[PDB]
Design a protein around this ligand. Structure first.
Ligand code: G4P
Ligand code: CL
Ligand code: MN
Ligand code: ZN
Length: 687
């Protein structure tokens, strides 16, 4: 009976994977089910059934979406790392590096009930994890979905905070990745736990009026078929489910059983844009227009085109989405559950992230997305998002100037740890202060945040020029200790490289740049000891380990572009090698310019935005075809606009090689028009 429940659930998963997975792939997925069963032996859920029944049910949801074996294995083991004695290394052993990273990723999106729930921070963290590997968010959405269905076993106190997090981030996130059925199901379960009484009243009315609503939807499908025929418009009509739109409305509105019965939604697929406008004109003649949105002339972020018109005919209300056969096909590039692999959807997910905006917050996210932060907490549960490699001092300054300036030590998870201790995500940090304490300048050696570095440089701003050179040497000697080296280990050849590399003449002047200038002692150490035993390699730019970097908005450098960094009081700013802002500051201060190289010419987990100016006028059908051609080439369409002389397109590409392929494919498709790549978006569109 207890083991027999697990076996009949495992057998139900086998039926789903047997048709589409290979014999060896099915054995690997079923082996993960046996290992998950072993890790959770004896553990039972709040309802009483064995724990493994949950990841099995989650893996069944994913197997029904025909997802890859790694996704299914990671879902079956996503709770064995934290809830069990088993570790990430155990998973790397039995199932490989890919499933371990997926399990790790899903685990990172978990919200502790005793820690702060910050909507904006969680949105950023989830968006970052999604763009790093979209499979992680699909597993997490399936996990959250299964939890929402069994929320009855949890206390009504708990039921609210989870339904709120699901509603605030998971529902928008599932729509973003094209999992609209999942998003609707999640939103339904959110209403069930956020307003049970109003939910039960609306659901019962929906259920009682369901057969009558079917009858009238069939009537209106025929009336719409007749209308298209009368106006000589060729098109297809699809009946759409409108249960979530009706529930969403009547949960906040007074009940009108006639409005609930006679409200229908349809999708109309036409042959051309001229027919779309012709149908809109025809509909206006026969109905009263409630709402109209033109997403053909103004396409949605991501590139989605459609005409959304809400009509009223007496008791009847119709919600119609009208689009061409090409628009419907373009929309199926970027959906994580479509023909394309979820990972190829990265560009589409990132281009359409402008659809989530709650404030211009999802406007300048590039630095955050490419550089995973650490999530450490105050003993009160307060979140602090810090760069990778941040020490206790960085946390102290992040909390406040008082705590940073007067810090003497810290208690990490109850254990006393010194001020240079690098932090790890999930740690609770208690800064120990002394009102008589003064910040020590030697902290610069391990400091990686700008709030901490600037606050320490204010103490050296009133110090002796000789003492500054000493502090700079003290900070460089400690930065070298990370690689088992020191200043006495530096040969004359090592010093000669540093002085030439920093456009400087003496050793004391290099120390002045570390102590008072904007040269971080970590960048000096990473240049002398390159790619050898540096203590999650998130780094896209070589030698920037332990420090956070920023992309300049003047030139917007993309992976693969020749780049050069600029050392400022805000950190290191990455610019394209021929940016006019960069060359201006290189002429004035060549010592503040550091040459930079991208670690790998083609990293697949990152996406950037390229700005294009196509020297040709494009009509409605040509713009629609341009969006299609971009999306078909795994490049998301962030924005398109066409005047009578040019057509601008902001496109989300992987690297400089990808944008070269897109430009080359667009040129031969359009009869070789001139296409120029801009440094920043044109003022005609935004800017
Ligand atoms: N809905 C439901 N949940 C159950 C049941 N039995 C155990 N749980 C677990 O309760 C957890 C709820 O998370 P918290 O809000 O942190 O509650 P907690 O502090 O008591 O763990 C879930 O962890 P999780 O999967 O990691 O989700 P989460 O921690 O990301 O919310 C879920 O696995 C049950 O019968 N129904
Ligand atoms: Cl020009
Ligand atoms: Mn779980
Ligand atoms: Zn620049």
């Amino acid at each position: 009976m207890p083991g027999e429940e697990v076996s009949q659930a495992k057998q139900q998963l086998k039926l789903i994977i047997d048709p589409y997975l290979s014999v060896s792939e099915v054995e690997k997925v079923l082996a993960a089910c046996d290992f998950g069963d072993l890790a959770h032996t004896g553990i039972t859920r709040k309802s009483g059934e064995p724990y493994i029944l949950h990841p099995i049910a989650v893996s069944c949801i994913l197997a029904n979406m025909r997802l890859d074996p790694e996704t299914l294995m990671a879902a079956l083991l996503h709770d064995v790392i934290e809830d069990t004695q088993y570790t990430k290394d155990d998973i790397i052993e039995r199932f490989g590096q890919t499933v371990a990273e997926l399990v790790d990723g899903v685990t990172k999106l978990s919200q502790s009930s005793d820690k702060e729930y910050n909507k904006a921070a969680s949105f950023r963290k989830i968006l970052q994890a999604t763009l790093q590997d979209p499979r992680v968010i699909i597993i997490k959405l399936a996990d959250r979905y299964h939890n929402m269905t069994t929320l009855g076993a949890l206390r009504p106190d708990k039921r609210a905070r989870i339904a709120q997090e699901t509603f605030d981030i998971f529902v928008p996130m599932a729509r973003l990745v094209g999992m609209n059925e999942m998003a609707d199901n999640l939103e339904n379960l959110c209403y069930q736990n956020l307003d049970l009484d109003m939910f039960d009243n609306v659901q019962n009315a929906l259920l009682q009026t369901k057969p009558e609503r079917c009858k009238y939807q069939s009537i209106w499908e025929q009336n719409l078929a007749e209308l298209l025929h009368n106006y000589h418009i060729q098109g297809r009509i699809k009946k759409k489910n409108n249960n979530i739109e009706l529930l969403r409305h009547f949960v906040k509105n007074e009940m009108d059983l006639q409005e609930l019965t006679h409200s229908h939604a349809f999708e109309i697929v036409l042959q051309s844009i001229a027919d779309c406008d012709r149908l809109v004109a025809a509909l206006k003649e026969n109905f009263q227009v409630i709402q109209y949105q033109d997403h053909i002339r103004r396409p949605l972020p991501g590139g989605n085109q459609s005409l959304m018109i809400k009509l009223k005919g007496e008791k009847t209300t119709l919600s119609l989405t009208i689009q061409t056969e090409l628009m419907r096909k373009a929309a199926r590039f970027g959906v994580v559950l479509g023909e394309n692999a979820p990972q190829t959807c990265r560009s589409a997910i990132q281009a359409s992230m402008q659809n989530l905006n709650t404030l211009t917050t999802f406007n300048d996210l590039l630095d955050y997305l490419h550089q995973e932060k650490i999530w450490v907490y105050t003993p009160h549960g307060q979140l602090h998002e810090l760069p990778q490699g941040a020490t206790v001092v960085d946390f102290a300054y992040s909390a406040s100037l008082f705590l940073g300036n007067h810090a003497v030590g810290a208690k990490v998870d109850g254990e006393i740890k010194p001020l240079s201790t690098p932090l790890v995500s999930g740690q609770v940090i208690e800064i120990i202060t002394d009102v008589l304490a003064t910040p020590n300048p030697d902290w610069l050696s391990f400091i990686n945040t700008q709030k901490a570095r600037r606050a320490l440089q204010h103490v050296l701003k009133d110090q002796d020029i000789e003492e500054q050179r000493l502090v700079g040497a003290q900070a460089l000697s400690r930065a070298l200790k990370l690689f088992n080296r020191s200043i006495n280990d530096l040969s004359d050849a090592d010093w000669l490289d540093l002085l030439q590399w920093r456009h400087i003449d003496n050793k004391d002047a290099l120390f002045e740049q570390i102590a008072v200038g904007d040269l971080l002692p970590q960048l000096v150490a990473n240049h002398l000891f390159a790619n050898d035993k540096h203590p999650n390699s998130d780094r896209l730019i070589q030698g920037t380990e332990g420090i956070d970097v920023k992309y300049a908005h003047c030139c917007n450098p993309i992976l693969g572009d020749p780049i050069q960094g600029h050392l400022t009081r805000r950190g290191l700013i990455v610019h394209r090698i021929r940016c006019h802002n960069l060359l201006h500051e290189q002429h004035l201060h060549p010592e503040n310019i550091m040459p930079l190289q991208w670690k790998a010419d083609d990293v697949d987990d990152v996406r950037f935005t390229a700005y294009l100016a196509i020297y040709m006028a494009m009509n409605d059908e040509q713009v629609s075809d341009l969006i299609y051609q971009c999306r078909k080439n795994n490049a998301g369409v962030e924005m398109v606009h066409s005047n009578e002389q040019r057509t601008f397109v902001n496109i989300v590409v992987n690297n400089r090689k990808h944008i070269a392929k897109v430009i080359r494919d667009l040129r031969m498709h359009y009869g070789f028009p001139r296409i120029e790549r801009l440094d920043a978006p044109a003022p005609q569109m935004e800017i």
